[PDB]
Design a protein around this motif. Structure first.
Motif, PDB file in Angstrom:
ATOM      1  N   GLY A 291       0.995  -1.183   0.099  1.00 10.41           N
ATOM      2  CA  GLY A 291       0.012  -0.153  -0.077  1.00 10.41           C
ATOM      3  C   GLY A 291       0.831   1.319  -0.053  1.00 10.41           C
ATOM      4  N   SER A 292       2.010   1.024  -0.307  1.00  8.78           N
ATOM      5  CA  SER A 292       3.028   2.517  -0.647  1.00  8.78           C
ATOM      6  C   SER A 292       2.725   2.990  -2.099  1.00  8.78           C
ATOM      7  N   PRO A 293       2.326   3.923  -2.409  1.00  8.57           N
ATOM      8  CA  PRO A 293       2.239   4.399  -3.920  1.00  8.57           C
ATOM      9  C   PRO A 293       3.605   4.691  -4.673  1.00  8.57           C
ATOM     10  N   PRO A 427       1.889   7.760   5.975  1.00 10.16           N
ATOM     11  CA  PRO A 427       1.040   6.734   6.308  1.00 10.16           C
ATOM     12  C   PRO A 427       0.901   5.587   5.624  1.00 10.16           C
ATOM     13  N   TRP A 428       1.951   5.192   4.878  1.00 14.58           N
ATOM     14  CA  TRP A 428       1.863   3.883   3.969  1.00 14.58           C
ATOM     15  C   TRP A 428       2.648   2.798   4.901  1.00 14.58           C
ATOM     16  N   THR A 430       5.027   1.361   8.757  1.00 13.18           N
ATOM     17  CA  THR A 430       5.480   1.636  10.204  1.00 13.18           C
ATOM     18  C   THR A 430       6.844   1.383  10.310  1.00 13.18           C
ATOM     19  N   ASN A 440       2.535  -1.096   4.538  1.00 13.13           N
ATOM     20  CA  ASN A 440       1.166  -1.579   4.761  1.00 13.13           C
ATOM     21  C   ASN A 440       0.856  -2.510   3.666  1.00 13.13           C
TER      22      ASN A 440
END
Ligand code: CU
Ligand code: CU
Lengths: 657, 657
Positions: A291-293, A427-428, A430, A440
């Motif tokens: 889920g990282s762009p 936000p992608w 941790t 993510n």
């Protein structure tokens, strides 16, 4: 001449049959240089199999499916060998696909990047000297999909890491760049280099062996008192070759390079009436979309089953550590690149375990002296496979109430990418350790069910709990408590495209609409009870959504046809996701009938993973489950003829006192 | 004079303390005729307890809460006895409530209806002769709520059944009418008689003991080979009185008449730093609302905890049958109506069990010779209670990754009502046997968590997975894969009123916003992962919704105050649900602050049950689970100092070969 036919038509290919098949194919392409990618059973057509099994019909031919490469030719060739005649009976060339990545296809990539001058250069710029290349490692992934090359070359992307010592867990020390490797030429063709460079971490490795832990927290805990499980009189289950019998269930345990375990021909013996349940059940595909762009991380959406193979990645399980108790093991057999059979020993383990209480009731009237307790036993058929960093533990569980459960435990190691000293991971992802960004991601699975609930001619339905539409205070719902189960039978494929709904606690029935339970008046069914059903988070039209069209709904039901196994297509790597194949083909225009016919039911389930430091450096097992349970299949609880562990009737209790 | 103070301030009242309390109360009301309904520990205020435990503070007084009846007075009186001084220190009269139904309050109802001339008459009209009344049975329920009487009399409703033989399971043979019984006078005051009469079934009873099964299917299955579990060297856990230590967890195991098991003062020892997690956790209430609208079935929505009591109903568990392995038992102590202590032996059982793999990873590079496997052990603290027809099995499970799970298994027998030969049961129930209608119903539970995640000052939040709001093809989400966890911190009570959402795979964090994980930068939390969260199907404003205001949302968070235990109020039976008490009181106008303070977190979970014939005559265990798991609490996987079951490093594997 020909190999001995197997005990049973669904038995995987023996090592002799694999070698007979690859000899057959080598001879058919004599004078060409070829290598083997896949050699596996072509399972018999469903109609042929059932007819053979239940109607005294023709013995299906024993067939092997093969995928090969030819040097200097694009793509693959695939076909079918008839083993009884040692001949190729179907063959074709697919110049614009790329096949599953085998262990041998992947094993050489680490040495390719260690010796490539451009990679060395990036290692040096990243703070690793040219003469410490033996310390640079990589996990070799499919490229997945990269629009700069399509399927025109066979490609891998290397996720690069560093180890200070060979016994380190490398995942604390990722590097910032991504070599792209031509699988057939064994050459790096490109390196994706980020605009912002991050040099290798200076921190200590984040390690998890006892010697590391002693250094890190001072000491191991003491060895715990043991918990020993024995079966001094043996097991209640019976295997005959690959055929299991246990607690009235009967089925065939198959195995292949791609799906891993495949359970077939599943029936239940209901006091002498042997009733089919499922023809086949297995996991048919997966996708694990990150889920990282940021580039190139869009290329992280492995379809592990179709791109590497749950059989190919499967661990040799050993007695005590992986499976404790009294175990029956099966081996797995594949082909290597030269056409020679390879064996994974103990790839499947089978055992039975206590599973607490099956049922209990006591009468308060004599202070519970009137009481009946019966303990449950479950049967477990499992494998564990390793997809580079992650471990997937798969447990097919049969239960004495007639339910069947799939349980999965996810463990292994987070996929990690490098994080600069001042870089925010969110936000992608941790920051799970200094300089470590764990992005993510979702883990999604496509469970493929080919049902024959009490025989052939089946349907499927969504079942939604609903409040009465009559309002509080009406004659029909005076106190407002009325509620019911709303059943929506799927008539065409399109109706079936449904998701799990918390609002209605949705479940799905697979049923036989030609029969009727004599008590309830409903059709016999198995009910899918499954709530770990994440939405696909990637957007419509995204690469992920296109390559995994099955993942967009929790349930997809389509007509049966032969060879509708793999819902992202037959040859997954480097498919852009454009085109009518796999599930998108089977769905068609959504209009074909799926009521009372031969259907296939593909369920998308799994989890969405926001990493935390508890997950690192090695992750505690994370559980996933679904269940298929009989509802209106039996006329009463089918386990009541199991001897109770304790039973005392009212008359008996009165006599005791 | 005074009883010996207990080992620990949370220890339940001993039998001596119960008797000292009831002697104290009898003396205070000398010359009045009274009976005891409840005598239980009044637990110390939270502030007093923590201060005592961690700040060298005052020893909280040892107090007993009592509820009594006085003959010819409406309602109850309740109060507090100080045990050290043998005196009543607080007392009041509640003339318009009715208390929990004790075993003795219920035991006489069957004989009351068997001897009542009007009931006899209905039995006769139902096809049972007047001289076979010894064959008529009933399950005595609270009336629940009936607007014809309010709380002005103490009432029960008798669900009436027939047994052909004393050893029959009566639930195949319900009768059509419902006597209403005055609990204190021991008299039937009314009978609800349906407009359409259905006479007793002529079918055989639907029975489940071995002798019945032999008659019914011919023979029992053979006794299965045994599976034996031993701990030859003992257990890893340590109990000191009621205080448990196991795998770094420490906590107090309490027990009371109402909630059953209560776990308190839960901490985890993180390498010498003992970190609080929860002050208290338990089930605080239940409701089981039936979904037939026809009169009088609206009165079927038992709040078992508040109306009968999970302690009062709890079974004596025995070794082997209920809990196998090496078990540590606790007893439970209550008061009977005369003020004498009663003991339930072995009400709680505690043991440890193997729980498969805790974690595993192997390196593909040396064909998995580099490998580490560590097996998991779980600790189980359980009870099983019987609410007339149903059995609830409760399992509090501690795990070596630091998670805590509640598992429940529902078994026992469906509540049944009579069905005429030509009567359709649907859509409100299922004909599970001839003339037997098993009505639809939910089973809902309110888990009460009083947290102190890493100490005092906590908050709660909903966590929703979301796709990036930037579209596919944008610079911010070029391939449309980006996703994140959206955290909504609850600031006021009203924000907290939330439900489980499948669309976002919602979970909830309980966290300490005054601290920060040094790796991830997030606050330490425990995450509630729970997906068995049915909507309340009963309508807003319905009797069910009013009596169980907590059940309308999956999560309700309110400020802590002392004695906010029971969310449908302190005295549940016969409450109409009108008024500001329980959760409705604690919610108030929704505006009070719940960010970084002392909070209470009530979670509504459970299942919606559409009965099927597999459930009858005795139901196979049905599972419910939720988990509270550490996220950003630790800085790494906290089980890595557990000795592995198998471990071989890369250096070690090279030497082997
Ligand atoms: Cu994950
Ligand atoms: Cu139920």
């Amino acid at each position: 001449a020909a190999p001995a036919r197997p005990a049973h038509p669904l038995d995987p290919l023996s090592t002799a049959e694999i070698k007979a098949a690859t000899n057959t194919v080598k001879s058919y392409f004599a004078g060409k240089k070829i290598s083997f990618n896949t050699v596996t059973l072509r399972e018999p057509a469903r109609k042929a199999y059932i007819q053979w099994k239940e109607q005294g019909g023709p013995l299906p031919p024993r067939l092997a499916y093969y995928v090969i490469l030819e040097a200097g030719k694009p793509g693959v060739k695939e076909g079918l060998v008839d083993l009884a005649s040692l001949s190729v009976i179907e063959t074709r060339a697919l110049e614009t696909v790329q096949p599953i990545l085998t262990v041998e296809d992947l094993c050489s990539t680490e040495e390719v990047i260690r010796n490539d001058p451009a990679v060395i250069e990036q290692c040096v710029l990243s703070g690793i000297p040219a003469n410490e290349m033996h310390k640079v490692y990589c996990d070799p992934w499919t490229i997945g999909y990269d629009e700069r090359w399509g399927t025109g070359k066979r490609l891998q992307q290397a996720l690069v890491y560093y180890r200070s010592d060979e016994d380190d867990s490398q995942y604390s020390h990722p590097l910032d760049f991504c070599p792209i490797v031509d699988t057939e030429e064994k050459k790096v063709i490109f390196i994706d280099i980020p605009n912002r460079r991050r040099k290798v971490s200076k921190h200590k490795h984040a390690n998890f062996y006892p010697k590391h832990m002693i250094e890190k927290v001072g000491a191991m805990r003491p060895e715990a008192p043991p918990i020993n499980v024995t079966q001094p009189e043996g097991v209640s289950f019976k295997m005959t070759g690959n055929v299991m019998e246990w607690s009235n269930f009967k089925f065939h345990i198959g195995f292949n390079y791609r799906e891993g375990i495949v359970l077939s021909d599943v029936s239940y013996n209901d006091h002498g009436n042997v009733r089919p349940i499922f023809h086949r059940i297995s996991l048919s595909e997966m996708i694990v979309p990150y889920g990282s762009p940021e580039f190139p991380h869009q290329r992280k959406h492995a379809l592990d089953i179709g791109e590497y193979g749950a059989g190919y990645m499967t661990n040799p399980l050993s007695l005590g550590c992986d499976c404790k108790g009294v175990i029956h093991y099966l081996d797995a057999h594949f082909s290597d690149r030269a056409g020679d059979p390879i064996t994974v020993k103990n790839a499947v383990c089978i055992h039975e375990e206590d599973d607490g209480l099956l049922f209990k009731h006591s009468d308060f009237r004599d202070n519970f002296a009137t009481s009946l307790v019966t303990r449950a036993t479950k049967l477990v058929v499992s494998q564990i496979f390793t997809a580079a960093n992650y471990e997937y533990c798969l447990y097919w569980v049969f239960m004495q109430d007639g339910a069947i459960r799939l349980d999965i435990r996810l463990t292994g190691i987070l996929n990690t990418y490098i994080l600069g000293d001042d870089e925010e991971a969110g936000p992608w992802g941790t920051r799970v350790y200094p300089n470590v960004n764990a992005h993510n991601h979702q883990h999604l699975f496509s469970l493929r069910i080919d049902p024959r609930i009490d025989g052939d001619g089946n349907s499927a339905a969504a079942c939604d709990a609903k409040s009465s539409p009559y309002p509080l205070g009406s004659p029909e719902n005076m106190y407002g408590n009325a509620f019911y189960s709303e059943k929506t039978t799927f008539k065409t494929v399109k109706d079936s495209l449904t998701n799990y709904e918390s609002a209605t606690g949705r479940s799905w029935d697979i049923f036989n609409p030609n029969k009727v339970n004599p008590y309830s008046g409903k059709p016999p069914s198995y009910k899918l009870v499954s709530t770990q059903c994440p939405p696909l988070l990637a957007k419509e039209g995204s690469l992920v959504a296109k390559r995994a069209p099955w993942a967009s709904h929790s349930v997809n039901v389509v007509p049966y046809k032969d060879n509708r196994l793999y819902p992202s297509g037959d040859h997954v790597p480097q498919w852009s996701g454009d085109g009518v194949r796999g599930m998108r083909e089977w769905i068609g225009d959504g209009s074909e009938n799926i009521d009372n016919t031969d259907i296939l039911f593909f369920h998308t389930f799994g989890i969405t993973h926001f990493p935390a430091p508890e997950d690192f450096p090695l992750m505690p097992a994370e559980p996933i489950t679904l269940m298929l349970r009989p509802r209106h299949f039996f006329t009463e609880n089918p386990g009541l003829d199991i001897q109770p562990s304790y039973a005392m009737t009212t008359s008996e209790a009165k006599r005791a006192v």
